[PDB]
Design a protein around this ligand. Structure first.
Ligand SMILES: C[C@@H](Oc1ccc(Oc2ccc(C#N)cc2F)cc1)C(=O)O
Ligand SMILES: C[C@@H](Oc1ccc(Oc2ccc(C#N)cc2F)cc1)C(=O)O
Ligand SMILES: O=C(O)CCC(=O)C(=O)O
Ligand SMILES: O=C(O)CCC(=O)C(=O)O
Ligand SMILES: [Mn+2]
Ligand SMILES: [Mn+2]
Lengths: 267, 289
């Protein structure tokens, strides 16, 4: 299909460049449907050359679902929905999201998707990595799949803003989840928020989660997205993970983002 | 700025770590000294460089490679008819065997003198799928703590091809197709050689980590139980995503990678599709501290 937009897949795993559409304008049914189809298929989609306003950013995001900001990020003045991924040139230390993860999985219902918009990015440096948890799951052997399919995992934010109160609040998600849009099964673990496999001792859980982390972040499951000014990107927060790359010390980097609300991860 | 630093070529870095696209040059022609010198500087800085839209012949491919050093074909790969120097990375659309190089490594480090570089040319590649990953072993070394550097900089590592065409390969079931891979002598596969864990690049003068999970067997003098944790950490460290870059291929793209200070990795995400590149290998000298 794709008659209203042009789609250029980035890899054989995930990622696709979308052109032939103006995000500054309202989307008709046929065009929106094609975009949603590509999103469900390619999991991370990006649109070069979309110099959209804050308002148009929010409006595009709302097409995916309710705009429900992530807890920990700072919003731009006048727009609670639009939050900042900002690093000054002078700034030093460690970068936001510089390990493989997906957003806010300590929530009973984590975000469904994130709409990111490049405002000011370096000519090179500051790529974002993404990976497919569909592919991570599908590449596990049938025996391993059957072995871990019924496991549940305890998530909490203790490492991000917890002790290590709301940061210590635990929630339980299935280890393998069915995407409510695509119907497709994907692996659902991440080293940032996952604490233990429910019901297992530390000795039992640690090596299994460790393998899954190593498996999921295999290089051949990833894609690498380069940013340019006015690039608008949407990632699926359920079936992908992402990673920032701190290879731009001394350079200014500024992107905004809206967060699309989701429902309980379900088996 | 690169635009003013380079006068004969144009350089566009791919990441803040390594990789650069090079334009403004015709690899069909002999390169003059000034143009070659700029290319060599860019190669030393960015470690992996590629030239889009270079529709060259097998002879021109060989001629360009020769600027880097003498041609020295890797033992394992088959060559094309009429050109012993030009070897194949070829995968038929219908084969389902082992994909060549689908783990982080650098080429033929089991050799007493592994390759210095490889010049690879896309012949027929998928529209998407089949990217090659690269990483900088300069960066991998430079990001280790001062204490970890002190701890391991004096170590040596045992290399062999045993898992590629030696006893360990023969004892397992995942085999390469005869498309691009020669039948090999098992004893040659098991032959061990010892290289430093940290080497000095002879062109850049920079220190880089020198270990890879394909060919490295153990730290010299250590038991396997002692070696595995250190080596496993180093593999995990070196292959950190932020130390990598990802190259997408297009027909007639010519790429050169530094076989000493980088590692690379095939990506098997193009099942059912034909993929064919050629490559010439540049001979190196014994890795040294
Ligand atoms: C916005 C996002 O919050 C963050 C904020 C910072 C993040 O960076 C991290 C990277 C690695 C690790 C680890 N291990 C922890 C982090 F907090 C990761 C996620 C979210 O989870 O919704
Ligand atoms: C051509 C090249 O030879 C190869 C051929 C295949 C390679 O891929 C692998 C080989 C063994 C193993 C194992 N065990 C894993 C690999 F990814 C890696 C290198 C070379 O080293 O010169
Ligand atoms: O800066 C980036 O590339 C991504 C940072 C991140 O993890 C996020 O915005 O959630
Ligand atoms: O096919 C690739 O992407 C790289 C294969 C490889 O490792 C090699 O040619 O040495
Ligand atoms: Mn994030
Ligand atoms: Mn190789």
């Amino acid at each position: 299909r794709f008659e209203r937009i042009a789609v250029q897949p980035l890899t054989g795993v995930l990622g696709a460049e979308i052109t032939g559409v103006d995000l500054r304008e309202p989307l008709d049914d046929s065009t929106w449907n094609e975009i949603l189809d590509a999103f469900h298929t390619y999991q991370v989609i990006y649109f070069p050359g979309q110099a959209i306003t804050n308002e148009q950013h929010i409006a595009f995001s709302r097409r995916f679902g309710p705009v429900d900001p992530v807890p920990l990020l700072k919003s731009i003045e006048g727009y609670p929905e639009v939050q900042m991924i900002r690093r000054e040139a002078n700034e030093s230390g460690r970068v936001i999201g510089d390990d493989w993860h997906t957003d806010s999985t300590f929530l009973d219902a984590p975000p469904a998707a994130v709409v990111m918009r490049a405002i000011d990015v370096p000519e090179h440096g500051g790529d974002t990595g993404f990976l497919s948890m569909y592919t991570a799951w599908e590449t596990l052997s049938p025996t391993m799949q059957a072995t871990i399919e019924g496991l549940n995992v305890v998530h909490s934010a203790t490492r991000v803003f917890g002790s290590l109160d709301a940061g210590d609040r635990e929630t339980v998600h299935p280890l393998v989840v069915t995407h409510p849009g695509s119907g497709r099964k994907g692996l659902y673990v991440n080293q940032v928020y996952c604490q233990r496999i429910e019901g297992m001792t530390d000795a039992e859980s640690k090596p299994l989660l460790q393998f899954l982390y190593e498996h999921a972040t295999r290089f051949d499951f990833t894609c690498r997205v380069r940013w340019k000014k006015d690039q608008v990107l949407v990632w699926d927060n359920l079936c992908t993970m992402h990673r920032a790359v701190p290879d731009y010390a001394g350079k200014f980097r500024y992107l905004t983002r809206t967060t699309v609300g989701g429902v309980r991860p379900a088996r």
